[PDB]
Amino acid sequence: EDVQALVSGKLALRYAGRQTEALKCVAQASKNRSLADFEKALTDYRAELRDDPIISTHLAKLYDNLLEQNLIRVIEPFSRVQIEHISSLIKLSKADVERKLSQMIL
Amino acid sequence: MSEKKQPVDEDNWDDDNVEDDFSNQLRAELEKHGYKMETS
């Protein structure tokens, strides 16, 4: 929300372009804790995200944090449940989500 | 003062009886070495 508010500054809006909207869409995807949205944003603007020499270094950590947030929000709304349903909703395998849940419990 | 009662006859960290219960011989050898010998 801070970057979304800050990009609208007068000096900021003086420097408009397409890289700024790429960062805006990445921030919007990360705000509501959606993995698919961030993946779509990465694929749509691949010429700017995985092209600079430094952003790709931090992409992995950003992905890990986003996966944590997505798992938290998708597992929040109920209680005792299966693992097949949650893996289908998160669109992952069965072993990886189990390892991740064990690590979060630890 | 006194009677002498003739006609009858932290200094240690913390005092708990668990410490003295041990009768084995060091986990390194008595247990880990003893059952880590390839009996299996």
Partner: protein, 194 residues
């Protein structure tokens, strides 16, 4: 308090009188494994740049820490045995060198059962150390002590877990401290007035 006060790795260790820096780092990691828990062991002792730089020159201690942190319980026991052998003959650790060990072992036991609910003792044989009878005896003698809250069934060899409330544990300590203080104050009261 020892592990708390040993946060001077970056605030200088110019007191070379008592010991050298490498021994200081080994002592601080040894006490940090006792005092503090996972959310701080991951924040202060595993992320420190200087402590990691020093530890890079000591393969044994780095292995002994990573084995516990990376959940490789099988290799943990060799390092634990070597460390306790080292500190048995070491100064200012000998008179209670056993007690330290008696924590780490049971600590590891409490670090595995808290995720699952019905893990069998068969899995622990190849995942924690060979010998089903040894694990059974250790688990029983640690259950009997009142800590490591769980339960074991031997007819089918199944371990179950339970979650006692944090009010029972917070009550016997009050009652025992009260008992000790009452004994002391009664002794004080009747020392005076003949």
């Amino acid at each position: 308090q020892a592990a708390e006060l040993f946060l001077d790795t970056v605030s200088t260790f110019t007191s070379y009188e008592l010991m050298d820096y490498k021994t200081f780092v080994t002592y601080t990691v040894y006490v940090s494994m006792i005092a503090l828990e996972r959310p701080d062991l991951r924040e202060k002792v595993i992320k420190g740049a200087e402590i990691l730089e020093v530890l890079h020159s000591l393969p044994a201690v780095r292995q002994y820490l990573f084995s516990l942190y990376e959940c490789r319980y099988s290799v943990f026991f060799q390092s634990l045995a070597v460390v306790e052998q080292e500190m048995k003959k070491d100064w200012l650790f000998a008179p209670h060198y056993r007690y330290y060990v008696r924590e780490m072992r049971i600590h590891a036991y409490s670090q595995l059962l808290e995720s699952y609910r019905s893990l069998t003792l068969g899995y622990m044989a190849e995942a924690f150390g060979v010998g089903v009878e040894f694990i059974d005896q250790e688990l029983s003698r640690f259950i009997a002590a009142g800590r490591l809250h769980c339960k074991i069934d031997k007819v089918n060899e199944i371990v179950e877990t339970n979650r006692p409330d944090s009010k029972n544990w917070q009550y016997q300590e009050t009652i025992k401290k009260g008992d000790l203080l009452l004994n002391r104050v009664q002794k004080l009261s009747r020392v005076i007035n003949m």
